[PDB]
Specification:
CATH class of the largest domain in chain A: Mainly Alpha
CATH topology of the largest domain in chain B: Transferase(Phosphotransferase), domain 1
CATH architecture of the largest domain in chain A: Orthogonal Bundle
Oligomer: heterodimer
Bound molecules: ligand 55S
Radius of gyration of chain B: 20 Å
Distance between the termini of chain A: 35 Å
Family (chain B): Belongs to the protein kinase superfamily. CMGC Ser/Thr protein kinase family. CDC2/CDKX subfamily.
Distance between the termini of chain B: 30 Å
GO molecular function (chain B): ATP binding; cyclin binding; cyclin-dependent protein kinase activity; cyclin-dependent protein serine/threonine kinase activity; magnesium ion binding; protein domain specific binding; protein serine kinase activity; protein serine/threonine kinase activity
Shape of chain B: globular
InterPro entries (chain B): CDK, Kinase-like_dom_sf, Prot_kinase_dom, Protein_kinase_ATP_BS, Ser/Thr_kinase_AS
Enzyme class (chain B): transferase
Number of strands of chain B: 10
Subcellular location (chain B): Cytoplasm, Cytoskeleton, Microtubule organizing center, Centrosome; Nucleus, Cajal body; Cytoplasm; Endosome
Shape of chain A: globular
Helix content of chain B: 25-40%
Chain lengths: ~260, ~300
């Protein structure tokens, strides 16, 4: 739709700042931690696989969760309820055939009842004031992919893989905007696979240089190198599939050029 | 919550919910209230409401119907909208004997294209443009309404819901089962509506998907690989389709001048890639003398 491409990019750059969670929020949660959140997001990855949901749905759900927990204190017993309602809302927003509510009750192992899921759904809507059309890492990556020469589907799947790993760890990735994580992920995928770098044409589009992406890149490179040891593994399993060209099997680079 | 609103009468039922006319007792404002039942869904808040509200909060524009407020209950959600006076369908019937003046057609098309360009710039497809969803006021404005079939798109798009757009206003790429569609589907709808304001009858009033295709093909020619690269590999294309010759556009909408015909033809281009954007259409010479007349309203 090349004609609205730049208007849309501009608009998403504006809205990503408005949908941004609060970077410090876990410090203010008395009862939950980054490690509990990692467990939850990893579980949502599995749920996404189980029901064959879009990656976008997963990214949206995690945005909803981070924004909700930015203002609402939640006990550990209830963190999965928040996450289940967020995935339900994301599915309703984004999916052609979302799973029905009963399916969402079933995958929580009847920890929660259906009316609890529906009531959380409504509370999450109130808290986010219905502002659900949030920009994601995935939406930026997809635009950035159009600047390949030519398209390389391993580069594409590996970028999505790295962007997805960023969802698991609130420290450090909550401090980076989606467009920046997408930038770091695209560059790191492109260099890992082809040896090439963040292209000139994307500097013109985004205003980001390798310099400006460096802090995120340094974090993301470390996450990639340590992905095999991480307590959470569902994203590595998912990306062994041929649908993603088995990219979780590719060797991360020992070092980057800079 | 609803303490301050006084219901006046029911307007109708769109894609979901029911719409009433109401007035704010404290300010005097006349509003349209869309009532949405939640206890009917122990599936919860419907996807159509979730989309309509999240998108309409972002889309603030003089040719897009304005969402003023959202009022919750446990059991009901009420959307408060600015009230408009009638739909374009009603207005066209009211105009049957006397015709819609060209200045007003031009004004309405210009305004609709502004509204649509705004939607498309904000990554929103409407997917249900038709005269019943286009609302006018006593001051010469027209606005896009009923965003219950709308969605947020990505660049580049993926496969979205197939069962989309009312049949008469549905683009050929959807009828032929294309894997991808985009903003061009809304322009197609608008092109059908432009022709309809001029003649006062629907351009392609088909009774089925195949009847719709055949009506389109009789007016614009059966598309081939020259006019639309890739048509013949599209999923619901049949090589048995009759091959009709294209009609010259001065017969399609006989009252339309040269500039009008040029514009209509770029809006009804088969190839979605070549179909004119709303943004580009605003600069077409058809609009060089555009004004904003006030219609003759018989509320
Ligand atoms: C047939 C009734 S009318 O033409 O006299 C008429 C139409 C519209 C309004 N005002 C109005 N209506 C709606 O939504 C009504 C639905 C729209 C979709 C099709 C079914 C009806 C509005 N939404 C937001 N503002 C609105 N204003 C008055 C009279």
């Amino acid at each position: 739709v090349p004609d609205y491409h730049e208007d849309i990019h501009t608009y998403l750059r504006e809205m990503e700042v408005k949908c941004k969670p609060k970077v410090g929020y876990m410090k203010k949660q008395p009862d939950i931690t980054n490690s509990m959140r990692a467990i939850l997001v990893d579980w949502l990855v599995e749920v996404g696989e189980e029901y064959k949901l879009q990656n976008e749905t997963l990214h949206l759900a995690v945005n909803y969760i981070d924004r909700f927990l930015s203002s609402m204190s939640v006990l550990r017993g209830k963190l999965q309820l928040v996450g289940t309602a967020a995935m339900l809302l994301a599915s309703k927003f984004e999916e052609i055939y979302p799973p029905e509510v009963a399916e969402f009750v079933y995958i929580t192992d009847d920890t929660y009842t259906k009316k609890q899921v529906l009531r959380m759904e409504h509370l999450v809507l109130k808290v986010l004031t219905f502002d659900l059309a949030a920009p994601t890492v995935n939406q930026f990556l997809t635009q950035y992919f159009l600047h390949q020469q030519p398209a390389n589907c391993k580069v594409e799947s590996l970028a999505m893989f790295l962007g997805e790993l960023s969802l698991i760890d609130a420290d450090p990735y909550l401090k980076y905007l989606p467009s920046v994580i997408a930038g770091a992920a695209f560059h790191l995928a492109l260099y890992t696979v082809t040896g090439q770098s963040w292209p000139e044409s994307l500097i013109r589009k985004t205003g980001y240089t390798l310099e400006s992406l460096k802090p995120c890149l340094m974090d993301l490179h470390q996450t990639y190198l340590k992905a095999p040891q991480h307590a959470q593994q569902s994203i590595r399993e998912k990306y062994k599939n041929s649908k993603y060209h088995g990219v979780s099997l590719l060797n991360p680079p020992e070092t980057l050029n800079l | 919550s609803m303490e301050n609103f006084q219901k006046v009468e029911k307007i109708g039922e769109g894609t979901y919910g029911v719409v009433y006319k109401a007035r704010n007792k404290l300010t005097g404002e006349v509003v349209a209230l869309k009532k949405i039942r939640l206890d009917t869904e122990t599936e919860g808040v419907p996807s159509t409401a979730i989309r309509e509200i999240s998108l309409l909060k972002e889309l603030n524009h003089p040719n897009i119907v304005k969402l003023l407020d959202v009022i919750h209950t446990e059991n009901k959600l009420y959307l408060v909208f600015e009230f408009l006076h009638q739909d374009l369908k009603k207005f066209m019937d009211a105009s049957a004997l006397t015709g819609i003046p060209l200045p007003l057609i031009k004004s309405y098309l210009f305004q609709l294209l502004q509204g649509l360009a705004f939607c498309h710039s904000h990554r929103v497809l409407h997917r249900d443009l038709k005269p019943q969803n286009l609302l006018i006021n006593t001051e010469g404005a027209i606005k896009l309404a009923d965003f219950g079939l709308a969605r947020a798109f990505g660049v580049p798009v993926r496969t979205y819901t197939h069962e989309v757009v009312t049949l008469w206003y549905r683009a050929p790429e959807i009828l032929l089962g294309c894997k991808y569609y985009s903003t061009a589907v809304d322009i197609w709808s608008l092109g059908c509506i432009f022709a309809e304001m001029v003649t006062r009858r629907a351009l392609f009033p088909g009774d089925s998907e195949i009847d719709q295709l055949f009506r389109i093909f009789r007016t614009l020619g059966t598309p081939d690989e020259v006019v639309w690269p890739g048509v013949t590999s599209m999923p619901d294309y049949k090589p048995s389709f009759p091959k009709w010759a294209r009609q010259d556009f001065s017969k399609v909408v006989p009252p339309l001048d040269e500039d009008g015909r040029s514009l209509l033809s770029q809006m009804l281009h088969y190839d979605p890639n070549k179909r004119i954007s709303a943004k580009a259409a605003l600069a077409h010479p058809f609009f060089q003398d555009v004004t904003k007349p006030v219609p003759h309203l018989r509320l």
